[PDB]
Enzyme design. Structure first.
Site, short mmCIF file in Angstrom:
data_model
loop_
_atom_site.label_atom_id
_atom_site.label_comp_id
_atom_site.label_asym_id
_atom_site.label_seq_id
_atom_site.Cartn_x
_atom_site.Cartn_y
_atom_site.Cartn_z
CG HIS A 41 -0.52 0.43 2.46
ND1 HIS A 41 -0.23 -0.47 3.45
CD2 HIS A 41 -0.30 1.68 2.93
CE1 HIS A 41 0.14 0.23 4.49
NE2 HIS A 41 0.14 1.54 4.22
CG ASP A 89 -0.14 -3.77 2.83
OD1 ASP A 89 0.35 -3.31 1.79
OD2 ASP A 89 -0.41 -3.08 3.83
N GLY A 183 2.85 6.16 8.89
CA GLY A 183 4.22 6.50 8.51
C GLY A 183 5.20 5.38 8.82
CB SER A 185 2.73 1.55 6.42
OG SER A 185 1.56 1.82 7.14
N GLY A 186 5.14 -0.57 6.24
CA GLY A 186 6.19 -1.09 5.39
C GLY A 186 7.45 -1.43 6.11
#
Ligand SMILES: Cc1ccc(O)c2c3c(nn12)CC[C@@](C)(NC(=O)c1ccc(-n2cnnc2)cc1)C3
Ligand SMILES: [Cl-]
Ligand code: NA
Lengths: 234, 55
Positions: A41, A89, A183, A185-186
């Site tokens: 995402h 994701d 922020g 995420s990932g």
């Protein structure tokens, strides 16, 4: 990260930060000198991304940062944002020029599917990132980190209206106050195994950072190890 | 009793069951199985998942 602490330099040398239209918008982890793993995402084919490894304080040049351009984005083949922005994701980013590995720029280990799942089952991992330090609050300048316990499936299902599928897990605290946030995420969720860190999750989402009764939702990396290993082999 | 289900066979990283109530330990890329047959030692300058900067 809400309720975390400042990382020391080189404490999470696999962490990267992604920059695009907005700088420091998501995290990632070093798989090898040419490949980063992040959340799908966060990225999209066509939108230009740069990766910064060896980062600590985003507002000070510390002489350890390595910036690289992303030349290929590989979202997981089952990712489909029209159905669900947060299922499957996960994505891989290929770098234009290899990173120079050193004490500040070091890959995260990735075990096989069986052991990645065993390591998640240990029940305690570390998350890190430059995301918000309060819900709807400012972002971090210095990399933050936090230990989060695994939350059993029944508790996490009872905490949200959204369906949490088996390829996700939840982590956080019954009292809230400590969580990943927007922020982050990932970025990585890692489990320390006798002094060696292994990637056990990808930071994905949550409803309200650090709110009591809500948890952070993570992508189970065990489900994707074979795909990561195949795609990033040098 | 020595099996991978009991204390991971005393392997630091990975365990595989082998012959005669024994196990075979192993390590991730960049590490070597040590002479004690259980531990994992770096085999490259910057092995994965390790903190090397002084904390
Ligand atoms: C990474 C993370 C960890 C913990 C968090 O609480 C967190 C947030 C956000 N990211 N985030 C985005 C903004 C924030 C308000 N969340 C969201 O805006 C949010 C809302 C809905 C979903 N979702 C929809 N369908 N499945 C999931 C996902 C995210 C809070
Ligand atoms: Cl070996
Ligand atoms: Na810096």
């Amino acid at each position: 990260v809400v309720g975390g602490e400042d990382a020391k330099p080189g404490q999470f040398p696999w962490q990267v930060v992604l920059n695009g239209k907005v700088d420091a918008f998501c995290g990632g982890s070093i798989v090898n000198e040419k490949w980063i793993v992040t959340a799908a995402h966060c990225v999209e084919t066509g939108v230009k991304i740069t990766v910064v490894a060896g980062e600590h304080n985003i507002e000070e040049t510390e002489h350890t940062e390595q910036k690289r351009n992303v030349i290929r984005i590989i979202p997981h083949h089952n990712y489909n944002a029209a159905i669900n922005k947060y299922n499957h994701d996960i994505a891989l980013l290929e770098l234009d020029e290899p990173l120079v590995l050193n004490s500040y720029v070091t890959p995260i280990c990735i075990a096989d599917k069986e052991y990645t799942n065993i390591f998640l089952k240990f029940g305690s991992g570390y998350v890190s990132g430059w995301g918000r330090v309060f819900h709807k609050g400012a972002s971090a300048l210095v990399l933050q980190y936090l230990r989060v316990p695994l939350v059993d499936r029944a508790t996490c299902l009872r905490s949200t209206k959204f369906t949490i599928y088996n390829n996700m897990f939840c982590a956080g605290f019954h009292e809230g106050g400590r969580d990943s946030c927007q922020g982050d995420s990932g970025g990585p969720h890692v489990t320390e195994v006798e002094g060696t860190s292994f990637l056990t999750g990808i930071i994905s989402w949550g409803e309200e950072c650090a709110m009591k009764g809500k948890y952070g939702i993570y992508t189970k990396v065990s489900r994707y190890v074979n795909w990561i290993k195949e795609k990033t082999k040098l | 009793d020595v099996t991978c289900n009991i204390k991971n066979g005393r392997c630091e990283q990975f365990c595989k069951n082998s012959a005669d109530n024994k196990v075979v330990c192993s390590c991730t890329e960049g590490y070597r199985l040590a002479e004690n047959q259980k531990s994992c030692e770096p085999a490259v300058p910057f092995p994965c998942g390790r903190v090397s900067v002084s904390q």
